[PDB]
Amino acid sequence: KNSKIFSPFRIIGNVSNGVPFATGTLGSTFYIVTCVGKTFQIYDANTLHLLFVSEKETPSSIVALSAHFHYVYAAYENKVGIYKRGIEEHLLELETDANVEHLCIFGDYLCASTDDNSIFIYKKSDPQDKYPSEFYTKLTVTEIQGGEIVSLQHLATYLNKLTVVTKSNVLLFNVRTGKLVFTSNEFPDQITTAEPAPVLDIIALGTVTGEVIMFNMRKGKRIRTIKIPQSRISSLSFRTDGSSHLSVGTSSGDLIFYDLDRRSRIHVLKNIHRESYGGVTQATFLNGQPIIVTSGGDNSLKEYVFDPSLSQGSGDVVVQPPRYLRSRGGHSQPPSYIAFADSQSHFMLSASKDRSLWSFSLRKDAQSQEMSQRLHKKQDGGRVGGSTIKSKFPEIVALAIENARIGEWENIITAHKDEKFARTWDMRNKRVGRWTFDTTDDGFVKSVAMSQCGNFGFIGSSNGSITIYNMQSGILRKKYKLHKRAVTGISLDGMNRKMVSCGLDGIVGFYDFNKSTLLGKLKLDAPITAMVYHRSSDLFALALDDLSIVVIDAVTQRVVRQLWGHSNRITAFDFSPEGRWIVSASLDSTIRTWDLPTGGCIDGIIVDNVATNVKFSPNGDLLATTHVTGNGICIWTNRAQFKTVSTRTIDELNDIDFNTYTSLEQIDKELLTLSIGPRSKMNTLLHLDVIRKRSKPKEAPKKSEKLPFFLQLSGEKSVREGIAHETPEEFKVTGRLGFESHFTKQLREGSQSKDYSSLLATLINFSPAAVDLEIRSLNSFEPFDEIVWFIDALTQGLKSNKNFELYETFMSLLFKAHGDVIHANNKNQDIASALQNWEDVHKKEDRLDDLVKFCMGVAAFVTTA
Amino acid sequence: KSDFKFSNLLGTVYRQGNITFSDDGKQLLSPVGNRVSVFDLINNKSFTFEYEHRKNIAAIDLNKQGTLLISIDEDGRAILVNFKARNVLHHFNFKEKCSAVKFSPDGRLFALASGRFLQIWKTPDVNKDRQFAPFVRHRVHAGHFQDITSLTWSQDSRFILTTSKDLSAKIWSVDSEEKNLAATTFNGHRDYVMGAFFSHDQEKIYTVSKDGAVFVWEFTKRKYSWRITKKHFFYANQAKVKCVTFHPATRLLAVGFTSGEFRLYDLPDFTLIQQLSMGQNPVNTVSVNQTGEWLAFGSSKLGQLLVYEWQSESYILKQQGHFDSTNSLAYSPDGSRVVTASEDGKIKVWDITSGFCLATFEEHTSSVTAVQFAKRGQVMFSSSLDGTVRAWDLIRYRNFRTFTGTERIQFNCLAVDPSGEVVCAGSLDNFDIHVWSVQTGQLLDALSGHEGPVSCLSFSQENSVLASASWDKTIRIWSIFGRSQQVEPIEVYSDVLALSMRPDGKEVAVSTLKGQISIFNIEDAKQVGNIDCRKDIISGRFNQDRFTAKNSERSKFFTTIHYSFDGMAIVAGGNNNSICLYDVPNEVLLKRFIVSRNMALNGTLEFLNSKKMTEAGSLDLIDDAGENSDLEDRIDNSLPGSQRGGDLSTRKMRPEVRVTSVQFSPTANAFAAASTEGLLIYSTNDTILFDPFDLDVDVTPHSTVEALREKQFLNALVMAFRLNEEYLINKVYEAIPIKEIPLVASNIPAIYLPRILKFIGDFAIESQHIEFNLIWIKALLSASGGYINEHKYLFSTAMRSIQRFIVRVAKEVVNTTTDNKYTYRFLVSTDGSM
Amino acid sequence: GPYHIKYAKNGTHLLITGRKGHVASMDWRKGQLRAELFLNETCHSATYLQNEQYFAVAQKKYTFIYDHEGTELHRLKQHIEARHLDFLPYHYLLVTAGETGWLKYHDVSTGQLVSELRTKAGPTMAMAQNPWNAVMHLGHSNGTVSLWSPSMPEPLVKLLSARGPV
Amino acid sequence: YKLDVLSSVHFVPKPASTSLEIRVETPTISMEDAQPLYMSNASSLAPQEI
RNA sequence: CAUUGGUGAGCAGCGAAGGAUUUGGUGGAUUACUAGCUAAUAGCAAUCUAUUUCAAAGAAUUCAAACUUGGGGGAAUGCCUUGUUGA
């Protein structure tokens, strides 16, 4: 389903899933396009870097992919998508409803074999163009002609022909005429793979029992036959660097190398890939190189290289065995735990059910590395017990990392499935650590935590005992015994003062930590299965058994929220970094998001696989989830970091929903109120002569004398909106009736209507230079009419208690500009009447004066004495 | 409390790279080293983006919608930022040194010059969500032979004009259909083509080169085939062209040369409109407004930024920062400007909110070591390495006192009395503490008794006792005033740098070279408690040192500490790149901040890349300064054993990352740290981080507005406080009416009182309801102003931002109206007759 | 960095000069390297002098003369910014041009600057030796080749070869 | 200058000079740096200096 | 009687088809993941060549150019500038 907070980003942690990959040769370098569920991934075979991932996920899983030079053809449920640099260039719907499952490209033709033994041929339109685009013909293989189609190949120098490998026969079609040129004899057993050899007109076939046939498609014979008993052959490739070897690959997970010249068997790599996930699904020699790329279903892509011979004269009979070159890998089984290792959202620890703990990198997939399990030596000199043949640890149930002391001592503390002690790990060196932390009540570890100083690590056992170890030395410091059933969560306050434990007897225990006491104990209504603490807001959430989340703050020991709405058990949940939301994922296939301020549910996602883990990134950038099926960590981005999401409750006042409050323009009309603008407009308008005299350069700029006079006017055609670029709209007074400025016209019309509201809007609109220039030229000569129009404009304006610092600075600009004429023809009736009613409204501004006097004198007395 | 995000970067208006204006030419985007600062010049305020390159950035653009930014550093690592959300979209690594990046005019494409390839990409959508790889390639063009130096799009986004280091400049069309419209190259120059521009109607092309020619290219006949019709020359001999721009609407060619001189021309005529000089260092950057009325220049060497309107000849701003030189900082008594004492010998008073330097003071002949305010914002004392403690009156901008010793020693720390009678200063080569009076300028006495250089001094702001601390592992408490002349020595474990005094003068916390912070009581001189601070320090490995960061003893201590203003926390930093803040009552680390993630600085990485270590030395120790294009940076003027001298070119080594002084803000919950990149300013905003205070199940936003609609105003306000959501506190605070302000203000409980005081403070600094906020302040101070008086240090950073609202906006408004009242009274009460 | 390659006058020895710092004098048909030195500044060009026994390198600014096993023998105080070195082997003269516009001949036997010649055409872009008469052709930024001799303080000839530089 | 930058500015200062500097009477708006704002608007000479 | 000194001989304890110490080589990381080459709006990648040539554009009295020198004293012969003499 669609969400609104989280949008899917990428499923990290996948390398391959056992679809046979494909290899493409740009120039003289090689890339390797591998399928990972529903996308492909292009790898740079010289160093196994991840170049491209395909842009849009296919509707169903990519079932067969191949690649020419720049283009990658990928076949899923019905159709073939022709991609280039990941971005899809074309999409070829086949005209059947059966699934396409093989494809081959040669010349103009794209040949797509479906599973009803039908073959669809596509042609280039005009043979310069880049990918085959038009429908050409359809071939059909009946039951009479051959068996089930198992591969579709084109072996070279064969003019518009196709070799179709059926399960019992090897057909040869002409694809221009649609003819069946040749049909071989029946093979005594079922051929499971095929591969065109670099010798001319020879294919290599490989059967379900261990036979490798060298079929000469122009004579129709088999040239030779190799037998690998009780082995099911799943890949074939040839060497082309000037040695004549063959690499067969067995679904038991082996890779066997044959010197075809002297019929020897060179080497056999045993258990190169796991049999239980498919064996080796593809192996191929990068041509002209002695390196071979293999890849299995175990989510792994390896390369192996043949070093030059050790014998300096013979060489070809002393073949040194293949060694290991680079390799990428991931988890083979879907992960069980997930943690973000650092606040930069760079690394994440992820622990799976194949009992490996990896550290995956969000920023570059070639930094992923499995954290090693090679143990240290014991401290005293005793022998370390355990098995001799090594195996991995039991699979990880919990882990807790506080990288405040990272690189000094151990950093991760982890809790494995059904064993009575925690382990430590070192994240900087990426290994296990020197300490295991025992529970000392003979009970399995149910929960770990560690302090934010990185000094203490807490173990909560399934018999109710919280033990507190040091991390640097690992010696048992303390042992709290409050719960009598299992302790399923521990956490400690950010200043190491109050720790909180929750167990599935249903009591939450609040302990002081410096003193050893408990402050309190809270009995809930259900057993508790998981606790997530939020350390800056001091609020922890407990996922109960009656399908709720109980948000409770640690300072006062109150349940403060209770989020209901889950129809099944909460598998995981995690706070937002700012402490505002909480994302829960539960066994009803849903992922909800609860705005805990408002209490309700913001968001709901119905996801098909049940998300077993949810983690917000420690800066609120990503959400990483982990499902029941799929070896990757599905990463989402929250869109509420680039937009704003509404906190409106879903199922199945726009300001308070969007968490804003745009402060209203003025609260009451009897209240003085400044202007919505810069604070510095008053000081700039009062002092913009001496400010600009500061702003002058120190000496005159050396200009040119042959400079046009009307240079400011000689522009072209980003327009200028200054007062000097003013145009008149549509019998000699200073400003005629064709030459009237907009300010003078609005002043005069407000003088007619006795309402200068549009005038005051205009003055508050334009700039300090234009304000100075309009108050500067106000017709101060014969009746002083425009001056008293400006005076009662300001009187009407400051009567309304808005913008009043602007109305007082406009009056100062008037008194400073031509208060000499107001002083001279003082005793004029119009000027004295306008100034008397100005003072009549202005005398009531001593409210602000004795208000700031009281606040200043009292605040200074209160602050000092 | 402790969730400090990066807020601002004062100092360093410009470091390296291109200056950009917004579309509406209000903000200018200026590259500080790995950040990007945005100065809004109209609403006088400024910020700095939180993201960070790993090297000093070199190219900038944002599209004409103002909606997303792209910044590239000096090896091609671009970062795409959503602009209005201030949150980074994508990181894309172009593989080689990108000279310029430029959006389209219509917005949908951009194009950047990576070496000899002009590569055109198409812009992602801002409203599309994030992808794995949002950039789709349009094309990659190779026609040039050497590197590209510039791009210029046409008006309609159809052609693109690139200028190369190879002596030509080519014109390329965006789509393949018009390949035959743009197939020409423009030869003929003698040196590097530094710019190639279209005219307004795209029928002329002006190509300006490095040596100082500008060619005019027209499509005439001698068919028609793009002749050059005219050549104009700048005739600047020893200088040569460093950065060109051309605004084609107003026909304005602005050129900045390699001698500070910019000339600006009207181009088809080539008449010198103006010619003047930024300084003496070359002009690295010119940009022009979209209306063409403002020009912004930048010189990288002193790090100075101009914007200059040229119609009026007047500098809109002419500022200059400090890279790798800030010996101290000090907030003003209202935390509104930071006064910075810098190694080139000068004091600078940086406004915080708008990131520009108000005044500067240069009367010290040599480096300034310490700055400290006194007499509550009127004077500011500063002590320096030339042997002077000199006082500065910040009202008449004058140096009204100079105190010298009779010994001519260089002072490295100073401390002023509360009532600024006495100024003391202590050196690093004398062991005495020189005590001068401020009224009579004489030396009052010289306190002796330390047997090591007096590393740090402070005066207790309440009982006026002098705590000094010196490298003889000894802190020492002098009662100076009032017949006593008493000295009290306290021994400590290792040699003290960085003493700080508690705000109430009861205690004093020292840093030590073990990397510990020991907090002593003064009256009973016992150790009240220490913090062990050497393992929570990020000491990097330098490029030139042969010992690991785990084993380096260089910077595992704190050389400057400061108490919080309530007295419960300590911020600290040193010559390492972690600034740590602790709380003293639990003695634990609240938070540790990384001051820089730059690799162009030295002490950043703990773990250096072992691809750079070769069979002879690291690869970042080879001086590739003889591969440079021109002599003025081929010169090696770095005389040998120079550490911390002057003039960064004279050092040969990468600048280390270091913090020299930290300070807690006196008004609003912030600290500032004087790093090498600049004054890093960290503060908490409460728009984010839901952090409630004892709420319950029934206290909700909807429940608060329901109690507000049913008008229980006290219930609604304390429900807003318990949610502690700022928009709810604001909404209820503006819904209460004036008649029952004083009832509500008397009945707010005693615990929510500092909440409402700090809210009214940081609200009323900027909001326009002046009479409302003064009504609230008068009600609160009259209601509960005995409680504030007896819990002084609790309300000491909340009441001090109230009188940053009264005396800085409200008293200014009252001064304006009082001026209007007395001008009215004089203009109507007297006789202007003839 | 990019390696400037010079051979001896017979085919015996090779002298490579990396742009970052790496100079090496070697026998390229034996496997014998007989000097390898990482002078941490940006070296430009290098030549042998009269044997495989001495070689002159044009470093960041000063030209240095090293002996067979790489020990520094001389630091030339003149030859301020060499970029192009050459050797006149019958006349025993190390010829040098660079980012100064000066051409300098240094007599290698006695140790004496025979001539400093103002090219007067800015930095020298190319420089070759005419092996028949040992006049040096320089190539400037005017597209002017100029034939020089250490006797005359002017070019013997000035050729207008190309447009742009050479 | 170059002795101090060589000596890594630990040095010892020159003694003293009772010089004489005059100052004209000018607004402290004009004694500032170029930015949109200002910091003080008094005059650079006191009442008693006037 | 100490050794918080060397060298050995043995217990207790640790203890799953062995354990300890040192070392050569290679691989992945060590910065944030958009593929190779070239004459590049496309070719090639098995190849650029037997279309790779023409046209057009293109030449500052800047016909100026060591911002590049360890200090004191000189400079015959040079070299630089200026004057001059004869052509």
Per-residue H/E/C for B224-272: CCCEEEEEEECCCCCCCEEEEEEECCCCEEEEEECCCEEEEEECCCCEE
* DSSP strand pairing (A71-75 vs A79-84): antiparallel
Question: Which letter does DSSP use for residue C122 in this model?
Answer: S
Report CA A509 to chain centroid distance, whole Å: 37
Furthest-apart CA atoms within chain D: distance in Å: 47
Spatial neighbors of D4 by CB under 8 A, at least 6 apart, are B366, B645, B646, D11
Q: Which of residues 1-40 of D touch A (CB under 8 A)?
A: 27, 29-30, 32, 34, 36-38
CA angle at C29 for the pair C23 and C35, rounded to the nearest 5° = 25
Do the chains contact at D34 and B318, CB–CB below 8 Å?
A: yes
Tell me if residue A813 falls in helix, strand or coil: helix
Do the chains contact at D30 and A690, CB–CB below 8 Å?
A: yes
The yes-or-no reply on A/D contact (3 CB pairs or more, < 8 Å) is: yes
- Long-range contact pairs involving B788-792 (C-beta distance under 8 Å, separation at least 24): B788/A862, B788/A863, B788/B753, B788/B757, B789/A861, B789/A862, B789/A865, B792/A863
Do the chains contact at C38 and B615, CB–CB below 8 Å?
A: yes
Residue pair C138/C131 in contact (Cβ under 8 Å)? The answer is no
* DSSP strand pairing (B398-403 vs B389-393): antiparallel
| Lookup: tokens for A547 | 């399908």
d(CA A429, CA A447): 24
- Give the best residue of D25, D39, D40, D41 to mutate against chain A (max A CB count within 10 A): D41
Q: In Å, what resolution does this model reach? A: 3.4
Q: Which of B407, B572, B594 is nearest to B5 (CA)?
A: B594
Q: In the beta sheet, which residues pair with residue A426? A: A431
d(CA B389, CA B438): 11
Give the HSE-up count for residue A1: Cα atoms under 13 Å, Cβ half-sphere.
15
Residue pair A701/B310 in contact (Cβ under 8 Å)? The answer is no
Q: How many residues does chain D have?
A: 50
d(CA A697, CA B263): 15
Query: Which residues of C fall within a CB distance of 8 Å from B620?
Result: none
What order of strands is seen across the sheet that includes strand A498-503? A487-492, A498-503, A507-512, A518-523
Nearest neighbour of B832 by CB, restricted to A497, A673, A824: A824
Q: Which of C86, C81, C42 is nearest to C62 (CA)?
A: C81
What order of strands is seen across the sheet that includes strand C82-88? C82-88, C93-98, C102-107, C112-118
Helix runs in B22-161, H state only: none
What is the experimental method? cryo-EM
| Lookup: tokens for C161 | 């070869």
Residue where the block lists tokens 């615990």: B751
Report CA B74 to chain centroid distance, whole Å: 21
| Lookup: tokens for A737 | 């009736």
Residue pair B365/B386 in contact (Cβ under 8 Å)? The answer is yes
Q: Which of A259, A257, A240 is nearest to A248 (CA)?
A: A257
Tell me if residue B767 falls in helix, strand or coil: coil
Furthest-apart CA atoms within chain B: distance in Å: 102
Extended strands (E) in A610-690:
611-616, 622-627, 633-638
Q: What is the 3-state secondary structure (H, E, C) of A590-609?
A: EEEEEECCCCCEEEEEECCC
* Cβ-based neighbour number of residue A475 at 10 Å: 8
Q: How far is CA B565 from CA A819, B380, B503, B510, B675, in A?
A: 49, 20, 6, 17, 22
Tell me the shortest Cα–Cα distance from B190 to chain C, in angstroms.
Answer: 6
Q: How many residues does chain C have?
A: 166
d(CA B488, CA A830): 78
d(CA B39, CA B46): 4
Residue pair A562/A549 in contact (Cβ under 8 Å)? The answer is yes
| Lookup: tokens for C127 | 């420089």
d(CA B380, CA A851): 31
Question: Which letter does DSSP use for residue A368 in this model?
Answer: -
Tell me if residue A407 falls in helix, strand or coil: coil
* Cβ-based neighbour number of residue A661 at 10 Å: 18
Spatial neighbors of B753 by CB under 8 A, at least 6 apart, are B780, B784, B787, B788, B795
Q: How far is CA A425 from CA A375, A383, A410, A432, in A?
A: 10, 21, 6, 4
d(CA B173, CA B152): 12
CA dihedral over B484, B490, B491, B492, signed as positive or negative: negative
Residue pair C117/C102 in contact (Cβ under 8 Å)? The answer is yes
Question: What's the alpha-carbon Rg for chain A, to the nearest Å?
Answer: 40
Q: How far is CA C133 from CA B172, C104, D10, in A?
A: 49, 17, 60
- H-helix or E-strand spanning residue B571: strand B569-573
d(CA A367, CA A360): 7
Residue pair A763/A814 in contact (Cβ under 8 Å)? The answer is no
Helices (H) and strands (E) counted in chain B, each on its own, are: 8, 55
CA dihedral over B342, B346, B349, B352, signed as positive or negative: negative
d(CA B88, CA B78): 11
d(CA A572, CA A561): 18
- H-helix or E-strand spanning residue B295: strand B294-299
Q: How far is CA B389 from CA B371, B386, B425, B445, B742, in A?
A: 10, 9, 8, 15, 50
Residue pair A648/A602 in contact (Cβ under 8 Å)? The answer is yes
| Lookup: tokens for A706 | 């042959």
Query: Which residues of B fall within a CB distance of 8 Å from A862?
Result: 781, 785, 788-789, 799
Q: How far is CA A277 from CA A22, A228, A294, A334, C39, in A?
A: 19, 21, 14, 13, 56
Question: What's the alpha-carbon Rg for chain C, to the nearest Å?
Answer: 15
| Lookup: tokens for B151 | 């791009």
* DSSP strand pairing (B148-153 vs B136-142): unpaired
Tell me if residue A653 falls in helix, strand or coil: coil
Question: Which letter does DSSP use for residue A549 in this model?
Answer: E
Residue pair B67/B87 in contact (Cβ under 8 Å)? The answer is no
| Amino acid identity at B320 | Q
Residue pair A301/A21 in contact (Cβ under 8 Å)? The answer is yes
d(CA A461, CA A482): 12
Q: How far is CA B199 from CA B21, B205, B251, in A?
A: 21, 6, 8
Give the HSE-up count for residue C28: Cα atoms under 13 Å, Cβ half-sphere.
14
Residue pair B752/B743 in contact (Cβ under 8 Å)? The answer is no
What order of strands is seen across the sheet that includes strand B87-93? B57-62, B68-73, B77-82, B87-93
Tell me if residue B797 falls in helix, strand or coil: coil
Report CA A567 to chain centroid distance, whole Å: 29
Residue where the block lists tokens 């006789």: B831
- H-helix or E-strand spanning residue B772: helix B770-784
Tell me the shortest Cα–Cα distance from A800 to chain B, in angstroms.
Answer: 14
Residue pair A638/B129 in contact (Cβ under 8 Å)? The answer is no
Q: How far is CA A274 from CA A271, A284, B94, B465, in A?
A: 6, 18, 39, 77
Helices (H) and strands (E) counted in chain A, each on its own, are: 10, 56
Nearest neighbour of B616 by CB, restricted to C38, C81, C99: C38
Nearest neighbour of C21 by CB, restricted to B167, B622, B625: B622
Residue pair B134/B152 in contact (Cβ under 8 Å)? The answer is no
d(CA B68, CA B82): 5
Neighbours of chain C (3+ CB pairs under 8 A): B
Residue where the block lists tokens 């040098």: C96
Residue pair A334/A327 in contact (Cβ under 8 Å)? The answer is no
d(CA A269, CA B401): 87
| Beta-carbon contacts below 8 Å between A and D | 20
Q: Which of A359, A421, A355, A433 is nearest to A392 (CA)?
A: A355
Which nucleotide shows the minimum CA-to-C1' distance to residue B141?
E40
Which nucleotide shows the minimum CA-to-C1' distance to residue C99?
E66
Residue where the block lists tokens 């950047």: B112
Q: Is C123 on the interface with B (CB under 8 A)?
A: no
Q: Which residues of B92-105 are buried (b: 16+ CB within 10 A; e: fewer)?
A: bebeebbbbbbbbe
Spatial neighbors of B127 by CB under 8 A, at least 6 apart, are none
Residue where the block lists tokens 């009032």: B482
Question: Which letter does DSSP use for residue C85 in this model?
Answer: E
Tell me if residue A849 falls in helix, strand or coil: helix
Spatial neighbors of B706 by CB under 8 A, at least 6 apart, are none
d(CA A666, CA A678): 17
Which residue is nearest nucleotide E45, judged by alpha carbon to C1' distance? A27
* Cβ-based neighbour number of residue B687 at 10 Å: 10
Written as one string, the DSSP assignment of chain D is -HHHHHTTT-----------------BTTTTS-BSS--S---BSS-TTT-
Q: How many residues does chain B have?
A: 834
Residue pair A227/A188 in contact (Cβ under 8 Å)? The answer is no
Nearest neighbour of B626 by CB, restricted to C38, C60, C141: C60
Tell me if residue B779 falls in helix, strand or coil: helix
d(CA D45, CA D40): 13
Q: Is C116 on the interface with B (CB under 8 A)?
A: no
Written as one string, the DSSP assignment of A272-328 is SS-GGGTSEEEEEEPTTSSEEEEEETTTEEEEEEEPPPS-SS--SSSPPPEEEEEEE
* Cβ-based neighbour number of residue B270 at 10 Å: 17
CA dihedral over B793, B798, B804, B807, signed as positive or negative: negative
Furthest-apart CA atoms within chain C: distance in Å: 45
Written as one string, the DSSP assignment of B618-682 is BTTSSB--SSSSSGGGT-----TT-SS-S-GGGS-SPPPP----EEE-SSSSEEEEE-SS-EEEE
Q: In the beta sheet, which residues pair with residue C146? A: C138, C158
Tell me if residue B331 falls in helix, strand or coil: strand
Residue pair B396/D44 in contact (Cβ under 8 Å)? The answer is yes
Q: How many residues does chain A have?
A: 865
Do the chains contact at C19 and B167, CB–CB below 8 Å?
A: no
Q: Is B807 on the interface with C (CB under 8 A)?
A: no
Residue pair B459/B481 in contact (Cβ under 8 Å)? The answer is no
Question: What's the alpha-carbon Rg for chain B, to the nearest Å?
Answer: 30
* Cβ-based neighbour number of residue B532 at 10 Å: 12
Question: What's the alpha-carbon Rg for chain D, to the nearest Å?
Answer: 18
Q: In the beta sheet, which residues pair with residue C44? A: none
d(CA A249, CA A240): 17
Residue pair B136/A84 in contact (Cβ under 8 Å)? The answer is no
d(CA B608, CA B610): 6
Spatial neighbors of C110 by CB under 8 A, at least 6 apart, are none
Q: In the beta sheet, which residues pair with residue B579? A: B593
Residue pair C163/C155 in contact (Cβ under 8 Å)? The answer is no
d(CA D22, CA D15): 22
Q: Which of A768, D40, D35, A803 is nearest to B45 (CA)?
A: D35
